[PDB]
């Protein structure tokens, strides 16, 4: 799921700041 | 003045790191539909779109840390990041629950306080509640449902429509 896909990279990789 | 898809991310930021009260997040829900052979019906369906999140038992927070790291592959886990993570897999039949319930009907729906959101009988205001959202918002747009929450009590203010309306696309 593409636009799940994207929000949840975002999601995670601002989660490790 | 007519945003597309492009940009959604950056509107959802914008519509929360320039607000004057204190979200946790934004999510945006875009439309979707969805034939069914038995009726022949196009059903409008509202599913993720988009979503910023801001944010501010061991258990629990066993499987939490666990399903993030499986997450990553495809440290505490609060529960409003949870919130946040577990609505992304979540959708909503026009006129049903709360994004569906505002799209269809072009509406505000604004719930501020703990019993607003458990009064409301609306069932992903009673899930926010749950994990301590104090504030749930849904605002009806061209295009779908820009959604907000917060872990506190917030009043309507004309500066936050006033960005909304600035950020998504309206009839």
């Given at each position: 799921?593409?636009?799940?896909?994207?929000?949840?990279?975002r999601?995670?990789?601002?989660?490790?700041? | 003045?007519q945003?597309?898809?492009?940009?959604?991310?950056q509107?959802?930021?914008?519509?929360?790191?320039?607000?004057?009260?204190?979200?946790?997040?934004?999510?945006?829900?875009?439309?979707?539909?969805?034939?069914?052979?038995?009726?022949?019906?196009?059903?409008?369906?509202?599913?993720?779109?988009?979503?910023?999140?801001?944010?501010?038992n061991?258990?629990?927070?066993?499987?939490?840390?666990?399903?993030?790291?499986?997450?990553?592959?495809?440290?505490?886990?609060?529960?409003?990041?949870?919130?946040?993570?577990?609505?992304?897999?979540?959708?909503?039949?026009?006129?049903?629950?709360?994004?569906?319930?505002?799209?269809?009907?072009?509406?505000?729906?604004?719930?501020?306080?703990?019993?607003?959101?458990?009064?409301?009988?609306?069932?992903?205001?009673?899930?926010?509640?749950?994990?301590?959202?104090?504030?749930?918002?849904?605002?009806?747009?061209?295009?779908?449902?820009?959604?907000?929450g917060?872990?506190?009590?917030?009043?309507?203010?004309?500066?936050?429509?006033?960005?909304v309306?600035?950020?998504?696309?309206?009839?």
């Amino acid at each position: 799921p593409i636009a799940r896909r994207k929000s949840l990279q975002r999601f995670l990789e601002k989660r490790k700041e | 003045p007519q945003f597309n898809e492009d940009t959604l991310q950056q509107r959802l930021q914008a519509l929360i790191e320039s607000a004057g009260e204190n979200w946790t997040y934004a999510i945006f829900w875009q439309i979707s539909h969805d034939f069914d052979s038995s009726t022949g019906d196009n059903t409008v369906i509202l599913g993720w779109g988009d979503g910023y999140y801001k944010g501010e038992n061991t258990a629990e927070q066993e499987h939490r840390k666990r399903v993030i790291r499986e997450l990553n592959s495809l440290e505490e886990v609060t529960d409003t990041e949870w919130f946040f993570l577990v609505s992304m897999t979540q959708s909503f039949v026009n006129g049903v629950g709360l994004p569906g319930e505002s799209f269809l009907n072009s509406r505000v729906i604004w719930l501020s306080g703990s019993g607003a959101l458990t009064g409301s009988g609306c069932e992903r205001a009673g899930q926010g509640q749950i994990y301590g959202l104090k504030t749930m918002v849904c605002i009806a747009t061209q295009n779908g449902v820009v959604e907000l929450g917060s872990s506190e009590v917030i009043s309507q203010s004309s500066d936050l429509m006033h960005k909304v309306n600035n950020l998504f696309n309206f009839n």
